[PDB]
């Protein structure tokens, strides 16, 4: 995640193993139950896309759901690209590039790039955009997996 250091700057720090394991354990115990979404939300505080793929990729089991989510993440990403067209002409030397759906999904962007966008002024909340897609896709799952 990207956290504030004592000095008063935003720097990246790694997520903790008993945080990781707590994510694992939630999924083990409460599967598709709604409490998973606030839980997720708390444990995703200050998290990167990269950390969010890590969390999704580290799941075991419920592979039908994991595939449905993936496909929701790509749909929501396809929709990001649709709604926000690429911008006019070449990229400025003085500036950094606008993200695509796949940069938001973490796929086409690097960590330093993910830190550029979030730490820069104005900052862009690429975590929160992926977060809604995850929560939206979580609703899809919850609604389906209701019996």
């Amino acid at each position: 995640p990207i956290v504030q250091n004592l000095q008063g700057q935003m720097v990246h720090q790694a997520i903790s193993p008993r945080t990781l394991n707590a994510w694992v354990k939630v999924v083990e115990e409460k599967a598709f139950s709604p409490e998973v979404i606030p839980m997720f939300s708390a444990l995703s505080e200050g998290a990167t896309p990269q950390d969010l793929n890590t969390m999704l990729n580290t799941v075991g089991g419920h592979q039908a759901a994991m595939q449905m989510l993936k496909e929701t993440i790509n749909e929501e990403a396809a929709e990001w690209d649709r709604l926000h067209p690429v911008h006019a002409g070449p990229i400025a030397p003085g500036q950094m590039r606008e993200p695509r759906g796949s940069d938001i999904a973490g796929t086409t962007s690097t960590l330093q790039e993910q830190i550029g966008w979030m730490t820069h002024n104005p900052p862009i909340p690429v975590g929160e955009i992926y977060k809604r897609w995850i929560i939206l896709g979580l609703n899809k799952i919850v609604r389906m997996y209701s019996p």
Binding site: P34, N139, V142, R143, S146, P147
Partner: protein, 74 residues
């Protein structure tokens, strides 16, 4: 399981049923107004005859602690 399929047993305490209701209501994502409509309506309707009888005597305007204490012996 659908919210319409939530019903109270003939020997099941209301309490255990009300828990089931707001769990399933917890997996419904509808507007609050619709969910208010579901609350006053469906809960009583799928409640068992013995408690159903009891709840009819509380009248309207009733709140959950009073419903929950009202159907306790049933």
């Amino acid at each position: 399981t659908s919210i319409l399929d939530i019903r109270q047993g003939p020997k099941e305490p209301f309490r255990d049923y009300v828990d089931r209701f707001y769990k399933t209501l917890r997996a419904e994502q509808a507007s609050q107004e619709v969910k208010n409509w579901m609350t006053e309506t469906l809960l009583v309707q799928n409640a068992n005859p013995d408690c159903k009888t009891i709840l009819k005597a509380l009248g309207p305007g009733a709140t959950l602690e009073e419903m929950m204490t009202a159907c306790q012996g049933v």
